[PDB]
Design a protein around this ligand. Structure first.
Ligand SMILES: Nc1ncnc2c1ncn2[C@@H]1O[C@H](COP(=O)(O)OP(=O)(O)O)[C@@H](O)[C@H]1O
Ligand SMILES: CCn1nc(C(=O)Nc2cccc(NS(C)(=O)=O)c2)cc1C
Ligand SMILES: [Mg+2]
Length: 861
């Protein structure tokens, strides 16, 4: 229930808009006969592709003249025209001397031989040599991840077959691929570069071309499969029990490879779960069990956690209201006062003080869901002097901090000092800490539930499974009889699911859909039906629909020249098309910069409620987080000119996370590299200088293209922090955003329209990373449906605009004209440098309506 926002654009512009759509051969659809029935201004996009069938990804064993990682030959170098025998012998002789000379490596080998998996080495190597596929089931902390790959390599080194061994290991997470590669490197007295290289998204330290272990993510591997798995002996799919969507999709591919090429060796590695599902899938492959030192863990629940602490809190069916009558009268009362949706931060402090009163030295492992709640818990404790450097050592563990800090969890602490690890679900199965005796469990999980109908990326904190709680408890009993503190009532444990819902059921498939087509694996639905647990129908339909809109797929659901580029780009297909459109407007670098910076957390550091002057000053008068992001990036790139220390002193002074800006940059260069290879010229991807205050037409175009990329994320500002969503529901501007004002203040915007990055609903709807746009930019790129009565126009059944019917039908025309050019450009990206004279004015007219002045707006007020 809002007024129609008027648009005071010049008559000069209206002529120019009408002039070009006439030249483009696009008639304006006339006003309706009566205003009660509106007519849509939406123009349908302006070929018969051959039907695909069943096809398996090809395989070939390791060679002596082939580098499997670079996927090319070895003409130059010492291992160029070497014999398989010369190599295998040299690689052994190299290892023989290293094991005798280095005494600090002998000390490391002596630790490797104590790990439970060691005694099974004989069985594992035998199982793999005989059977194509094998499952290596076993408890977390036995060393199946770190050792099994080495055993397989050493078995080929020591037996003089080292030239016939190249191992691929597929970790589900990003940090796990690096962490393990850096660990397995140290365990051979080397650095990653030599024998144990890695390759994650926008970061890779490739191994040597023979007798090597590549620790990559599944997504990285799938993108490099265009050719096929050429020059690889073993494929170790690690942490299958996590049920990562890409892991599940990979197992569908590998099953086809085992069937057609039974010489290859797959090695699935699972935790203590029901592996019968995977076993059956891979033709009842052997399940090599792995066990060792275990300890009985005395697990407690919220009833017991208030019983032995005498705790009292501050001022579906709620399970805290239920309580055993056997438990104390006050215990039952204290618990019922506590909310279930918020994790009890005060109770955790009381449990750390109970651990003290036992007088049994050991480290504490606190399982929280998000960094937001880990950063919360860390503050709470360090505010209390009792938890000081002399007495306590608190260490945060999540996949978004320096690897230096992630390694400090393993470092033994001074005697008397307690080590409390505020970790995520990373320390559940993927990695094991050795010092842990006591374990506190929130019994919560941070899952990315994406609904398509309203584009809601809800990071909901939902309850964990019985399998989660069972394996979180397991971490306690590795050193001694530990204690596990579950922060959920004995009633709530009953109303938990046996297992978690696999990602395959509750994730979008449009990224996997492209991969299927790119790898020529046939039909999207046809393939995904063969998955160990196929995805829901509606998710496949959604994915297929989502891709046909982008023109990534045709009517026959075959890969278009456009879609092929999107499949080769490791980003959201929509942000992939945005980048291509950037290359046409010669702002490709600026757009690549933005696209990249969505793969890492905002480089801005939090220092209170809202950002200070220094952080806001990057935003300028554009009222855009994305322009602030380019502004810091431009200012940071100039701070690198004066060497490495000048870079750090800038980052320090400006309160920026240097680690991010470098990873964001390295990503941008790789995004550029793929567009170049796809055909796009160098001249449209040059680091063009701009200003975030003065009139800049190139920056106007970047905000326009940005509106395209984030759609359907767009909102209307009413007052203060309150904004209206697409569905017509109220929402809050994120406290992080520059457009967020000070507590109870009036921010005066020259336009109420804002496209944004993430739509989050933790409690209420919060719009993060926002960018101001004009009514013209809204109609052009940030809207699909546009109806008109003659005076008013309706944009996706919300936001009414009192604007000329013609101008609206012209702007909606430019979109369809632009859409058509994207198709023509993707057939041959070279044509960007010499576009049609008619099409060069079409882009100039988009550049025109992109300007603030085009909607009668002046930012310098
Ligand atoms: N970075 C590391 N620092 C110290 N110990 C480590 C590290 N990585 C692994 N370990 C040790 O290796 C053993 C288990 O290794 P891992 O391969 O992660 O086990 P699994 O995959 O079977 O759970 C444990 O003793 C653990 O402490
Ligand atoms: C070209 C340099 N480069 N290489 C990689 C990479 O990770 N390659 C890789 C990964 C896993 C397996 C294989 N081999 S395969 C497909 O199974 O044949 C190859 C990343 C970068 C930048
Ligand atoms: Mg593991």
């Amino acid at each position: 229930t809002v007024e129609p926002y008027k648009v005071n654009l010049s008559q000069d512009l209206e002529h120019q808009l009408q002039n070009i759509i006439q030249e483009l051969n696009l008639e304006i659809l006339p006003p309706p006969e009566d205003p009660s029935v509106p007519v849509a201004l939406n123009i349908g996009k302006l070929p018969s592709q051959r039907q695909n069938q069943v096809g398996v990804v090809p395989w070939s064993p390791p060679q002596s003249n082939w580098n499997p990682w670079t996927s090319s030959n070895i003409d130059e170098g010492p291992l160029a025209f070497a014999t398989p025998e010369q190599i295998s012998m040299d690689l052994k002789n190299e290892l023989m001397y290293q094991l005798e000379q280095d005494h600090d490596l002998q000390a490391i080998l002596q630790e490797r031989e104590l790990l439970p998996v060691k005694k099974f080495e004989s069985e594992i190597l035998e199982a793999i040599s005989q059977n194509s596929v094998v499952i290596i089931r076993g408890a977390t902390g036995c060393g199946k991840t770190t050792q099994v790959p080495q055993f397989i390599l050493d078995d080929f080194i020591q037996n003089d077959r080292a030239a016939e061994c190249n191992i691929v290991v597929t970790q589900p997470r990003r940090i796990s691929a690096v962490s393990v590669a850096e660990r397995v490197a140290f365990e051979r007295g080397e650095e990653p570069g030599k024998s144990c290289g890695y390759s994650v998204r926008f970061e890779s330290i490739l191994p040597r071309p023979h007798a090597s272990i590549m620790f990559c993510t599944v997504g990285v591997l799938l993108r490099k499969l265009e050719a096929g798995i050429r020059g690889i002996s073993h494929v170790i799919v690690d942490e299958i029990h996590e049920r990562d969507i890409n892991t599940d999709f990979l197992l569908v591919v590998l099953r086809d490879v085992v069937q057609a090429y039974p010489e290859v060796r797959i090695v699935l590695m699972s935790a203590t779960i029901d592996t019968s599902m995977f076993c059956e899938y891979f033709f009842n492959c052997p399940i090599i069990e792995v066990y060792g030192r275990t300890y009985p863990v005395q697990e407690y629940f919220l009833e017991d956690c208030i019983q032995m602490t005498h705790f009292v809190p501050p001022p579906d069916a709620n399970c805290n209201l239920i309580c055993g009558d056997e438990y104390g009268p006050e215990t039952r009362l204290s618990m019922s006062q506590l909310n279930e949706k918020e994790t009890p931060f005060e109770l955790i402090e009381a449990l750390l003080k109970y651990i003290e009163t036992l007088n049994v030295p050991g480290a504490v492992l606190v399982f929280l869901p998000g960094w937001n709640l880990i950063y919360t818990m860390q503050k709470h404790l360090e505010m209390n002097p009792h938890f000081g450097s002399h007495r306590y050592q608190i260490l945060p563990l999540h996949s978004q901090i320096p690897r230096e800090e992630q390694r400090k969890v393993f470092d033994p602490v001074p005697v008397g000092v307690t080590k409390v690890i505020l970790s995520t679900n990373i320390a559940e199965t993927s990695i094991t800490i050795n010092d842990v005796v006591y374990v506190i469990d929130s019994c919560k999980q941070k899952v990315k539930l994406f609904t398509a109908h309203n584009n809601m990326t809800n990071y909901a904190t939902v309850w964990a499974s019985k399998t989660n709680l069972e394996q979180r408890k397991g971490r306690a009993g590795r050193v001694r009889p530990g204690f596990c503190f579950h922060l959920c009532s004995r009633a709530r444990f009953e109303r938990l699911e046996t297992h978690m819902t696999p990602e395959m059921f509750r994730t979008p498939l449009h990224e996997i859909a492209l991969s299927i087509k790119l790898l020529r694996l046939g039909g999207i639905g046809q393939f995904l039906a063969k998955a160990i647990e196929p995805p829901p129908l509606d998710a496949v339909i959604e994915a297929e629909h989502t891709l046909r809109e982008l023109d990534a797929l045709d009517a026959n659901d075959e890969l278009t020249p456009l879609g092929r580029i999107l499949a080769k780009l490791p980003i959201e297909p929509r942000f992939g098309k945005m980048m291509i459109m950037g290359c046409i407007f010669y702002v490709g670098d600026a757009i690549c910069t933005i696209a990249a910076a969505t793969c890492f957390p905002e480089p801005f550091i939090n220092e209170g409620k809202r950002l200070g002057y220094i952080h806001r000053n990057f935003a300028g008068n554009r009222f855009s987080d994305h322009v602030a992001l380019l502004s810091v990036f431009q200012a940071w790139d100039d701070a690198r000119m004066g060497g490495e220390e000048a870079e750090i002193r800038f980052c320090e002074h400006k309160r920026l996370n240097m680690a991010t800006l470098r990873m964001t940059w390295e990503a941008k260069v790789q995004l550029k590299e793929i567009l170049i290879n796809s055909g796009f010229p160098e001249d449209c991807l040059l680091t063009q200088v701009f200003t975030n205050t003065g009139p800049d037409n190139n920056l106007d175009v970047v905000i326009s293209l940005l509106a395209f990329g984030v759609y359907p994320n767009v909102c209307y500002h009413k007052e203060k922090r309150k904004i209206l969503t697409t569905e017509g529901r109220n929402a809050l501007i994120h406290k992080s955003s520059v457009n967020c004002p000070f507590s109870s203040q009036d921010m005066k915007y020259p336009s109420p329209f804002f496209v944004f990055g993430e739509k989050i609903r933790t409690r209420a709807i919060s719009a993060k990373g926002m960018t101001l746009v004009t009514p013209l930019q809204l109609l052009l790129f940030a809207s699909k449906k546009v109806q008109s009565d003659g005076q008013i126009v309706l944009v996706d059944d919300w936001i009414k605009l009192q604007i000329s019917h013609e101008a609206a039908a012209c702007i909606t025309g430019l979109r369809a004209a632009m859409e058509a050019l994207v198709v023509e450009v993707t057939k041959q990206p070279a044509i960007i440098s010499q576009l049609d004279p008619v099409n060069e004015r079409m882009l100039n007219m988009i550049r025109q309506i992109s300007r603030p002045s085009a909607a009668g707006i002046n930012l310098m007020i």
